[PDB]
Structure 1
Amino acid sequence: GSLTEDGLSYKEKFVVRSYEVGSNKTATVETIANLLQEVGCNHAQSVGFATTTTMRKLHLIWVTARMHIEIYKYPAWGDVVEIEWCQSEGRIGTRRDWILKDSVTGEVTGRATSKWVMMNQDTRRLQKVSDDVRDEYLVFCPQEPRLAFPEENNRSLKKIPKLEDPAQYSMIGLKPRRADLDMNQHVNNVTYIGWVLESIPQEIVDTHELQVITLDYRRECQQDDVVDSLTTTTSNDSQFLHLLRLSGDGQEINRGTTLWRKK
C-alpha cells in the first residue's frame, strides 16, 4: 500500500482469500468491511499516526457513529481488489470514505463512507471537535470536498427509525468470542455487521445479494454482554429494518437497514 502522489489519499491491493468467501465464492460483506478498516489503519500509520498529539493529551478518541457500504460486485476468491481518504466535517466530527475497484478492469465495484465522532476514552462522553484538533488533521485531508457518495439525496445520509416489537425475524443470545475483539479488547465494528445479518433468513441470502448496508452505532457491546438481533421486511428488491439490543434490559446498541437485489 502507498499514499498517492499528492499525499492526500491512500491505496492498497488485496488478494481475496479462501476463508474470506461465502457460498458464491465471492468475498462476504464482513471481509470487505475488515479490508476497509485495514486500509484505514495503514493510511493513518503512513501519515504519522489515528489520535493526534492534542487528542492524546486530553484522553480523546475517534469512534464510529455510522458505517454505509454499497457493493455492485463482490470480488471472487483469488481476485485482486484495489481500495482507495478522510475529510473534516466541521465541529461535528470526521468522515472516512472508500472506493473499491477491480484491479484488472479498473472499474468501481463498491463504495463506502463512515461518520466519526470525538469521545473521551474514560467517561465515554461525546464532544465537538476543537479548532486545535481540527487544524492538526486538515493537513492530511483534501481541502475541496471529495465524496464517495456525492448525489443530492443519497442512502448514506438517511435517518433510520427504531424497529417496533414484534420483529418479523430474530437471532437470540449472540455473544462475542476472543476473535471478535480488537487489540484493545473492544468488540470489532465488523462483528456488529455480522450480528445484524444473523437475523436475515437463509432463503434471502441464498437468492439475493446484499447491495447496501447502513449501520448506526449507539453503544458498545462489552465482551460479557449478550445480544439479540431483530429484522423486519419494509419492502425484485428487498429491504429490511434492523435492531441489535442487549438481551437482558433491551438496551439499544445498533440500528440499521439493508437492501438486497435478486440474483
Structure 2
Amino acid sequence: GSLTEDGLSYKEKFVVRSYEVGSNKTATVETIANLLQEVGCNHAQSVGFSTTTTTMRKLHLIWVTARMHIEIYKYPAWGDVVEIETWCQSEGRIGTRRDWILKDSVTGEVTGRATSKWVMMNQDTRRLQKVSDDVRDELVFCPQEPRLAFPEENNRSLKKIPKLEDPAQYSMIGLKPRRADLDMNQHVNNVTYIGWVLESIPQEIVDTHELQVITLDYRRECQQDDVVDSLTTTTSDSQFLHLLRLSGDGQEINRGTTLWRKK
C-alpha cells in the first residue's frame, strides 16, 4: 500500500484468501466491498487522518455513506492478487465522492470498479448539513480536475431507485447482526447490508448467475439490537429491486438494485 507519485490517489495489492471465496472459488462481493473499505482506510491514514479532519473532530462531524455502486467484470479467484486504486473528490457543498478501480496484478486489466457518495452528519444528533468551507479546503488530497471511475453519461450509478411494493416476490426475514458484523465503533459494518440485501435472492439465481452490478442507497443505520427483513422482486440478464426494513415498524433502512449475468 502506497500513495501514487502525485499523492492524489492510493494503491494496494491483496492476495485473495481461502475463506473469502464462494462456491465458484472466486472472491465474494462482500470480500470485494471489504477490500474497497480497507484501501480507503489506508489512503486516509497515509495522508494524515487518525483512527475526519481537525475541524470535523472539534465540532462532532462524521462522514456517512449515502450510496454505494459496484460493477464487477471478473471476480479474483482464490490465490490471485488484485490491485485496487482509490481516490476522493469534492462533489461541491453536497458532500464527498470516493472511487475505486480493481485490476489484475498479472494482466493489468480492469476487472471491476466502484463509486460511493458520502454526506456529513453530526455524530450525536444524526442530522446532516454540508456547508463547511474550511472542511472543503482541508481539497489538497484530491485531484482538482474530475477523475471518475464511472465517466459515461447515463450510467448505472446515478439512477433514482424506487421503493419495493408489497408483496415482495422473495424475502429473508429475522436478520440480526452479531459482534462480527460490528465495526471498531460498535456500529453495523455497511458491508453487512450488502450481504443482507442478497439474502433474499434465491439460491438458484446465485448458482446459475454471477452478480455484475449492485447499487445500494443507505437510508438509516441498523442498531445492534434491531431485526431486519430483506425483500426482492424481479424487474425484468436478471434485474432485481431490493428493500431492507425493520421487522417491527417496517422502517426503511436500505433500498437497491442488482444485475446478474448468466454463467
Give TM-score, length-normalised by structure 1: 0.99
Cα offsets for 1:196-248 (capped at 9, x unmatched): 0000000000000000000000000000000000000001x000000000000
Unaligned runs of 5+ residues in structure 2 are: none
Please say if residues 90 and 129 of structure 1, whose CA atoms lie closer than 8 Å, have aligned partners that are also in contact. Answer: no
Partner secondary structure for residue 62 of structure 1: strand
* 1:139-196 Cα shifts (integer Å, max 9, x gaps): 0000000000000110000000000000000000000000000000000000000000
- Determine helix, strand or coil for the equivalent of 2:32: helix
1:226 maps to 2:216: no
Rounded to whole Å, the distance in 2 between the matches of 1:116 and 1:165 is 30
CA contact (8 A) 1:118 1:129 kept: no
Question: Whole-Å Cα distance in 1 between the matches of residues 62 and 173 of structure 2?
Answer: 31
Q: Is the 8 A contact 1:240 1:259 kept in 2?
A: yes
Separation in structure 1 between the aligned mates of residue 131 and residue 121 of structure 2, nearest angstrom = 10
SS at match of 1:259: strand
User: Are the counterparts in 2 of residues 181 and 187 from structure 1 also a CA contact under 8 Å?
Assistant: yes
Match of 2:6 in 1: 6
CA–CA separation in structure 1 for the residues paired with 2:104 and 2:205: 26
Instruction: Compute the RMSD of aligned alpha carbons.
Output: 0.6
Partner Cα distance (1:187, 1:129) in 2: 27
Deviations 1:27-65 (A, max 9, x none): 000000000000000000000007000101110000000
How far apart, CA to CA, are the structure 2 residues paired with 1:154 and 1:14? 28
Higher mean alpha-carbon deviation, 42-51 vs 72-81, is at 42-51
Which deviates further from its counterpart, 187-196 or 120-129? 120-129
Q: How far has the Cα of 1:128 moved from its partner?
A: 1.2
Q: Residue 191 of structure 2: SS of its match in structure 1?
A: helix
List aligned pairs for 1:122-141, cutoff 5 A: 122-136=124-138, 138-141=139-142
Q: For 2:175 and 2:35, how far apart are their aligned partners in 1? A: 24
* Structure 2 residue matching 1:198: 3-state secondary structure: helix
Kindly, what percent of the aligned residue pairs are identical?
100
Contact 1:64 1:114 in 2 (8 A): yes
Question: Which of residues 108, 120, 123 is equivalent to 2:122?
Answer: 120
Q: 5+ unaligned residues in a row in structure 1: which ranges?
A: none
How far apart, CA to CA, are the structure 1 residues paired with 2:175 and 2:141? Answer: 39
CA distance in 2, matches of 1:231, 1:129: 37
Separation in structure 1 between the aligned mates of residue 230 and residue 26 of structure 2, nearest angstrom? 25
| Cα distance in 1 between the residues matched to 2:92 and 2:153 | 20
Deviation of 1:129 (Å): 3.4
C-alpha deviation, 1:130, in angstroms: 1.2
In 1, the alpha carbon distance for the partners of 2:81 and 2:24 equals 17
Aligned residues: 261
1:155 and 2:149 equivalent?
A: no
For the 8 Å contact 1:172–1:229, the answer to whether it is kept is: yes
CA distance in 2, matches of 1:15, 1:128: 38
Give deviations 1:56-106, integer Å, cap 9, x for gaps.
111000000000000000000000000000000010000000000000000
Q: Residues of 2 paired with 1:96 and 1:218: CA distance?
A: 18
Within a 5 Å distance, the mapping from 1:1-263 to structure 2 comes to 1-49=1-49, 51-84=52-85, 85-136=87-138, 138-235=139-236, 237-263=237-263
SS at match of 2:200: coil
Q: What do the CA deviations read for 1:84-141 (whole angstroms, capped 9, x no partner)?
A: 00000010000000000000000000000000000000100011131110001x0000
Q: Secondary structure at the match of 2:71?
A: strand
Q: Distance in 1 between matches of 2:27 and 2:84?
A: 14
Name the CA distance, whole Å, in 2 between partners of 1:157 and 1:42. 27
The answer on whether the counterparts of 1:243 and 1:254 sit within 8 Å (CA) in structure 2 is yes
Distance, in Å, in 1 between the alignment partners of 2:23 and 2:131 is 43
- Residues of 2 paired with 1:242 and 1:105: CA distance? 35
